[PDB]
């Protein structure tokens with residue numbers, strides 16, 4: 596699943612046995628209950644630009 | 651950076667300036683609070699290792715505004731496979747002597763997992779490249795951080811779309827081309843080591859390092875960038891290891 600459209604994951608994707616897929620996030624993020632979205636858990640997560648985010 | 655624009659202050663928060671004895675050396679990319687990724691060739695001529703400084707939160711080189719943070723570079727780690735004065739394996743991992751403090755103007759860029767980078771990031775067409783390097787071939791360097799949006803291409807398409815010089819280095823699996831062949835836009839000397847950064851689903855990731863090219867924005871040629879995805883495991887392992895004495899460390903690759 597992961598190979599195609601990143602398995603639907605917002606960040607990282609791991610393949611499991613037949614049809615099973617687990618999305619994961621970079622440190623400083625947590626996975627939402629939808630199983631695909633990542634939300635920041637710290638004030639300054641990597642790869643986000645604070646002046647635009649607070650904009 | 652040739653043909654780009656000023657990066658509005660704070661919108662390139664992972665950009666690093668490297669200085670030796672106060673003089674502009676190269677760029678770099680912050681990937682967490684103590685580690686910086688740059689280009690190995692930046693360190694070929696350094697004898698004064700204790701005079702190597704990384705600056706975060708920098709924007710305008712003419713004026714201190716208080717957001718700048720300077721750290722001594724405690725270690726420079728280079729892959730065993732890199733040969734000084736040549737193009738392949740052009741990557742260095744720098745450990746700062748003390749962590750930087752994350753702020754609105756100092757934020758790490760995400761180092762992606764390899765699979766995600768190869769399968770997904772490598773196919774995002776445009777990415778940003780940044781630095782205080784020369785504004786034109788044979789020209790002066792920039793006082794304000796510049797940024798440029800460049801398209802990535804397959805290496806097959808690079809070689810086919812480029813004018814043949816013959817003497818030019820091979821483009822290996824550890825590199826990729828990005829930019830324009832019409833002589834309008836490119837990164838340049840002085841930008842070496844800086845980020846090629848790729849946006850995906852709301853977040854920015856490190857995909858390349860300004861490395862080399864034929865002149866700057868030379869008609870018939872593209873910029874060449876270190877293919878960061880090849881080094882993810884190498885970098886991750888090093889960041890989880892204890893520091894060793896001596897500034898320069900050659901570490902086996904793979």
Ligand SMILES: CCC1(CC)C[C@@H](C(=O)NCc2ccc(C(=N)N)cc2)n2c1c(Cl)nc(NC1CCC1)c2=O
Pocket residue numbers: 691735736737738740818819836837838839840841842860861862863864865866867872873874
């Ligand atoms: C990587 C090792 C070095 C060692 C001098 C360093 C480097 C260099 O000058 N990088 C700065 C530099 C950075 C970006 C660009 C661009 N996007 N147009 C051009 C130059 N470089 C090297 C070499 Cl052996 N050959 C280069 N280019 C060649 C193809 C024509 C000569 C080159 O740019």
Ligand SMILES: [Ca+2]
Pocket residue numbers: 708709710711712713714715718
């Ligand atoms: Ca300044």
